[PDB]
Amino acid sequence: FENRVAEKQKLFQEDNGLPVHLKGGATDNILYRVTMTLCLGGTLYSLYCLGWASFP
Amino acid sequence: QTHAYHMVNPSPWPLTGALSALLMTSGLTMWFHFNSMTLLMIGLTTNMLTMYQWWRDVIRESTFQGHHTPAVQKGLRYGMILFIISEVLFFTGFFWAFYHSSLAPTPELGGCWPPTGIHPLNPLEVPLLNTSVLLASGVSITWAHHSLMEGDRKHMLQALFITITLGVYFTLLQASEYYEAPFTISDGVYGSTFFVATGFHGLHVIIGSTFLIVCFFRQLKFHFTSNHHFGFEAAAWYWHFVDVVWLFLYVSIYWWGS
Amino acid sequence: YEEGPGKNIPFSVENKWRLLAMMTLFFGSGFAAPFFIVRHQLLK
Amino acid sequence: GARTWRFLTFGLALPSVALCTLNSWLHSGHRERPAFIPYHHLRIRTKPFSWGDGNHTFFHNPRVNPLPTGYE
Amino acid sequence: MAYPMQLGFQDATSPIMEELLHFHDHTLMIVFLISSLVLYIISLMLTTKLTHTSTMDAQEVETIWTILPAIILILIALPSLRILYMMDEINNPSLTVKTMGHQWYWSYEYTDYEDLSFDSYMIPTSELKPGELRLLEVDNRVVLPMEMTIRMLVSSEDVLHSWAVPSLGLKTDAIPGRLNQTTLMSSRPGLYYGQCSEICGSNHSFMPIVLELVPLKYFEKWSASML
Amino acid sequence: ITAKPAKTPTSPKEQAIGLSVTFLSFLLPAGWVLYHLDNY
Amino acid sequence: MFINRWLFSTNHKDIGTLYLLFGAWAGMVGTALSLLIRAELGQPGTLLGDDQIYNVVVTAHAFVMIFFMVMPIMIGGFGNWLVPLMIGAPDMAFPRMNNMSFWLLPPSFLLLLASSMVEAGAGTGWTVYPPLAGNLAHAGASVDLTIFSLHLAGVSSILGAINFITTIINMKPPAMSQYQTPLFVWSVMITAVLLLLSLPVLAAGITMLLTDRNLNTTFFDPAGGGDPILYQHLFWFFGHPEVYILILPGFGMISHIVTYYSGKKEPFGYMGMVWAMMSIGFLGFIVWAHHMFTVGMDVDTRAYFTSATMIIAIPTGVKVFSWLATLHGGNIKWSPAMMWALGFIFLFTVGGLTGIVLANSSLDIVLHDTYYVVAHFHYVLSMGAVFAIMGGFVHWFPLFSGYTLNDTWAKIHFAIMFVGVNMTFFPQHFLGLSGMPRRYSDYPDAYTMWNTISSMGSFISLTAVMLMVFIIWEAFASKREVLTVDLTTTNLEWLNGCPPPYHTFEEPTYVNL
Amino acid sequence: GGGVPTDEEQATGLEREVMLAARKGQDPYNILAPKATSGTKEDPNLVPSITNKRIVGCICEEDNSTVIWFWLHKGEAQRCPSCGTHYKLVP
Amino acid sequence: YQTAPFDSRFPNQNQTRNCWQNYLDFHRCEKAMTAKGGDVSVCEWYRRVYKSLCPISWVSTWDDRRAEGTFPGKI
Ligand code: HEA
Ligand code: HEA
Ligand SMILES: CCCCC/C=C\C/C=C/C/C=C\C/C=C\CCCC(=O)O[C@H](COC(=O)CCCCCCCCCCCCCCCCC)COP(=O)(O)OCCN
Ligand SMILES: CCCCCC/C=C\CCCCCCCCCC(=O)O[C@H](COC(=O)CCCCCCCCCCCCCCC)COP(=O)(O)OC[C@@H](O)CO
Ligand SMILES: CCCCCCCCCCO[C@@H]1O[C@H](CO)[C@@H](O[C@H]2O[C@H](CO)[C@@H](O)[C@H](O)[C@H]2O)[C@H](O)[C@H]1O
Ligand SMILES: CCCCCCCCCCO[C@@H]1O[C@H](CO)[C@@H](O[C@H]2O[C@H](CO)[C@@H](O)[C@H](O)[C@H]2O)[C@H](O)[C@H]1O
Ligand SMILES: C[C@H](CCC(=O)O)[C@H]1CC[C@H]2[C@@H]3[C@H](O)C[C@@H]4C[C@H](O)CC[C@]4(C)[C@H]3C[C@H](O)[C@]12C
Ligand SMILES: [Zn+2]
């Protein structure tokens, strides 16, 4: 393999105001949206599960 | 700023981590009592997504953005040491459980250790092979460390590959020994102490092996310098911790407890 | 981010009467919860 | 040096693993399972397991792990 | 038993409970004195307009306020441990009685000679006889000989309980799979009450203990009558 | 400590309203539950 | 912007603020639970008619007060706000991991409130002893939800301890030794070391309870050769350190408040105070079995645990006398925070002394599992932690908010609370000496007078809590903006103004050697 | 056998700035404790700043546990209010 | 015989092993005596001690397990 660290340093130091978790580009936004959707949706489902289990 | 410390970009991973904890625990609840794995499989997935993105961002902040000054690296050194201490005290509780049960075997056991009807594994067979494997991996990871410090890319990769191979060998041997064992987790306090203590150790071997594989790919991608490679040091310290816990299990449970 | 008195908090203090409503609901919901938990357990 | 730790890896550590691998290899082969005795401190069931029929351990081996009622 | 508006311990029924009373008086004097001295010194520090705000040297005074507390702790520890070892000393019992805790009642076994055993349940409030004590009376009392060293052995057939009789200075946890020993000696005839002293579920409040202390001859005839 | 006078002074009447509303937010819901215990 | 700031924080001040809001909300839940306890006991007979619900209320009261009120306020709230400011650090070592310590607590709290809502709750006591907490006597999800609540609170505080130790060791000005850090910073470092070592042992024990309940292990089940008493050792190996964890940051805040309102530049005997906190922390690991004097342990073991427990009075005495020596010669300012601190010194001393009574195993036989123990810990822990929290809250509110409290209202609040807690807890000594068990829903008739007075006291503290909410409202409603603070030369946390900017110490302090 | 980058080749951002300044004996990110002068009005302690004020902590005597904190402003030397040691801002 | 005397092998609050040891000793002795067809009366001391100390449910459970072949002690 070849050392491509300098090209990743240029990408992550680009003066575009993006936070580090989104600075890789469009793929970061997708994986973020998948993660937060599963967390928030999962959490709403856990509250439904509590509602169900709170009664006999 | 005219200090050397890292002001971290606002991050969603602490929240996704906290919610993954909620989904894993409520999921285990739903699996043990309401016959369903759905919540648990969502929690495990979000937990793996959180860990991936969080440690990805740490690599972005250090290798790619240069935020790991000597002061920041010194902090991560303390954080990893303190994390390892907390894991030692966790194992201490299981060792206490083991010594408590085995030093004063109750009448239900036949008043002896090992209990009546327990046929322990021979400590000189696969458990001794496992000891040789983890000790060997402590030597190979040390070779990997010195190769990296000396600027030797090929030997660092070969040594670290050997170390991971031994971690996998240990894990496959242990899986095999679990399957072959004539006793189970339900075989009283002997099975309870054996499987829970070696089981948490097994999990730590898988976590440590995963950490080493992360270091292997980062090395392939040239992330580490001959002087700056804290992810490698942290994985090596964790790996020595896993070795040392094994030595204590081998002497206590496998040998003294047989 | 806004700095200074009334700006370093996740709730507004721009209107003392809306703030009273929000503080009422916040502390009130916490104090009420155990009474409604007991009611729940008694009604099963 | 890396040179010394490589010397130890190939000269001592892996030869040890090879010797213990030989030792394990030679002492393998299935030993005879003991007479089933329904001891009350073994095959504990206070709650069904959350998988299978509730009565099988997670890495149940029919050859060497009896159920509470005996070998399958 | 306790009486209304009681401040201190139930009157001692056993010599060891007498010892604990005298030890508590000694300890409580020390607690009163230290409490009072701290409140007085607070009030002394807070009642002058005179000031001294420069750096104060601490080492002379820190000797006083480590050594004096060390001596006070030794003066508590010495009689404390004398009593601990006195309770533990070999007494040769005349009788062994077992109690088993259950949700939510005590059973008693007297198996030195015959197989005598019975259940002991709280009298419901609605069934108390005039003059009887709410939450304290049982149907079947633990009849025991007065003025005799008795070995009590305590266990459980379910969850943790704890077998307590405050006026005898007794509290022994009732643990399944374990046989805990204590000794009981009453100086007097009478009725001595206690209450389950380990949270054991929804009727923890309602599984009391009643000892009935009588002459040996009466204990023997009661025992025979209970077979 | 020193401080400015209140930018939005809370008169005695305003304080009686805030104190009353605060106390009621604690007392009414718990009171409703305890009053209805028999019914539960 | 709101989500980035309050859900995605990497800022020690905003995370401190999240912890204070969480802990205040938790305090309302824990107070309601406490009032239900005292309502059941306020007259003879049954109020709830369901003692499983009484036991659930008692259990939840303790978990909420300990895990969701005291630890988040003292460590998460004051610790995150003050520690970086007091050492001139720009933030915590792990500012993103810090946010996860915070966000683990709402889910932990949700699992506890789920435990109480499913089946018949966990009516176990906060000790969660098997076999009562086992899958026979507590069948169903309630105890497992309680275990998982503790797991998440445990991870929160372990990662928090790693953060505080790293920050305090690594992020001081290079000229500043550990012996030039303020006592509050010492108190948080020592508390963090106790959490780091103690919580993993709790985690191991409650994990064993989980596996006994769900995977047919028998750690605590005699039928498999287990032992209920092993659970008790693992729990209290954690639980004694935990009670020092609950008071140490309070000791730290009391040192600062007494120093400040005495008009002193420094507490009396700084190195003695450091010595005392480290000694308490160490001895705190070797005394746990004083929670087990009635389980049937050997006489020599009881003699050791009695002796080792009494030793803690020596360093603790050094602190109490050092606080009085700090007042000595002070220009005393009778602020509401000083009143809280003086109430702390007195009430902590009373509770500490009843702990020395309990350390005597012989006397503990008769006092164990009685209201004497409840009286001891509501003095030393309940009033101690709460008085230090209220002192620190009234002292630093203007730093955190940029606004002043009404001092007259805050003095009224103190006076009501002082009356209420003493009326509540002092009579519980008489109930314990005279033999009233703890964890009871009802009592023999003789115990009526003290239970009646205790329950009437509980309503007085309720009035104080309601007034406290009004007082905080009045401060934000009126907006009196802070101008000057005295003694900034020995109170660095004030020197960046009220409130300090989002980013402080971007340019670090200059300290030469 | 080579192929591992050095800090000189691959360090970036603030890590690199700290690396390059240290080679020159310079400390722009405040990693080292400054050495006191005699602290007289003639020989004041020189306090670098990127702004017109900076907080000074004064440990007046060796092993004092109490640090004395104050803002040092651009202009005339100021004195520690405890020991009178002189400090002068050099923006 | 009034009750089981103090036994210096078991001097502590936990008397579980005292009950267990005397139960084992009785049944070992009864087997050794029945086997040669000697007299079980030599075993009487062990019998009186375990009957005094042992909970009825423990003896009952141990007796059932000896008859089942699941008693885990050596007799
Ligand atoms: C803030 C929390 C906190 C603190 C700091 C303490 C401090 C102490 N505690 Fe307490 N304790 C609890 C919280 C706390 N405790 C809780 C929650 C429980 C019960 C848990 C449960 O069952 O739910 C408990 C239970 C508990 C027990 C078990 C009782 C039983 O269940 O039977 C004992 C036994 O020794 C004990 C003792 C002590 C002692 C000796 C100290 C010492 O550290 C006190 C030292 C202080 C002083 C002594 C006062 C100041 C000193 C002087 C003025 C110097 C001079 C003094 C002398 C010479 C004596 N406590
Ligand atoms: C910190 C710990 C703590 C606190 C504060 C309290 C507070 C109170 N507790 Fe207790 N309690 C325990 C810990 C605590 N408790 C524990 C561990 C048990 C044992 C449980 C078991 O047996 O398993 C227990 C048990 C217990 C019992 C015994 C139950 C039984 O044995 O059956 C009783 C009886 O009266 C009692 C009452 C009260 C009362 C009336 C209050 C209060 O009402 C007293 C007044 C205090 C307040 C009202 C607090 C206000 C604080 C806030 C609102 C926060 C504000 C926040 C900011 C400013 C940022 N509690
Ligand atoms: C090669 C070793 C690798 C280990 C990975 C294997 C499986 C799952 C994960 C293991 C994690 C470790 C320990 C958890 C407890 C039990 C598992 C012990 C190890 C194991 O795998 O034990 C098996 C039983 O597994 C069982 O019950 C399986 C039960 C599965 C459910 C797990 C329950 C989760 C518990 C929650 C963890 C709490 C975490 C606390 C965090 C601390 C925070 C402060 C043994 O099989 P057997 O058929 O009984 O005997 C063999 C007979 N031929
Ligand atoms: C598949 C099985 C599922 C089970 C769940 C857990 C599974 C797997 C987890 C595997 C752990 C992987 C951790 C990868 C961390 C990568 C980030 C990293 O290593 O980051 C490094 C910093 O270290 C750091 O943060 C150090 C951060 C270290 C944290 C790791 C600790 C182990 C985590 C244990 C987690 C759960 C344990 C629970 C058991 C009860 C970056 O600095 P450098 O390396 O100096 O580089 C910079 C140079 O390039 C400059 O020249
Ligand atoms: C990204 C957002 C987050 C995603 C949330 C998704 C929520 C949807 C989950 C579907 O719900 C499932 O329904 C099944 C029934 O249809 C249940 O089966 C289980 O319950 C059945 C009920 O009888 C039983 O047969 C068995 O336990 C078992 O099959 C199962 O438990 C439950 O999970
Ligand atoms: C521990 C915390 C609790 C402290 C004590 C609370 C103090 C009481 C506050 C008032 O609470 C209310 O009291 C009313 C009665 O006074 C109730 O009305 C009830 O009774 C009225 C009079 O009979 C009826 O008109 C209403 O319909 C009926 O709901 C009402 O529901 C309830 O909210
Ligand atoms: C040819 C390549 C060079 C990589 C590079 O310098 O970019 C070499 C260097 C070290 C090699 C690795 C190590 O020699 C160890 C392993 C040896 C096995 O025979 C193949 C896989 C194995 C994991 C190798 C993969 C790959 O061929 C590597 C990575
Ligand atoms: Zn100076």
Residue numbers in the entry:
A (entry chain J): 1 to 56
B (entry chain C): 4 to 261
C (entry chain L): 3 to 46
D (entry chain G): 12 to 83
E (entry chain B): 1 to 227
F (entry chain M): 1 to 40
G (entry chain A): 1 to 513
H (entry chain F): 3 to 93
Authors' own words:
pmcCytochrome c oxidase (CcO), a terminal enzyme of the respiratory chain, catalyzes oxygen (O2) reduction coupled with the proton pump, generating a proton-motive force across the membrane. Mammalian CcO consists of three mitochondrial DNA–coded core subunits (subunits I, II, and III) and at least 10 nuclear DNA–coded peripheral subunits. The electrons from cytochrome c are transferred through CuA in subunit II and heme a in subunit I to the O2 reduction site, which consists of heme a3 and CuB.
To identify CO2- and N2O-binding sites, we treated dimeric CcO crystals with CO2 or N2O in both the fully reduced and the aerobic fully oxidized states. The X-ray diffraction data at 1.75 to 1.85 Å resolution were measured for the CO2- and N2O-treated CcO crystals and for an untreated CcO crystal in the fully reduced state as a reference. Because the electron density was significantly stronger than that in untreated CcO, it was assigned to CO2 or N2O. CO2 or N2O was oriented along and within the elongated spherical cavity of site 6. When CO2 is moved from the mitochondrial matrix to the outside of the cell, CO2 that has entered the O2 pathway of CcO from the membrane may be trapped at site 2. Based on the above, we propose that CO2 bound to site 2 could be passively expelled to the outside of mitochondrial inner membrane through this channel.
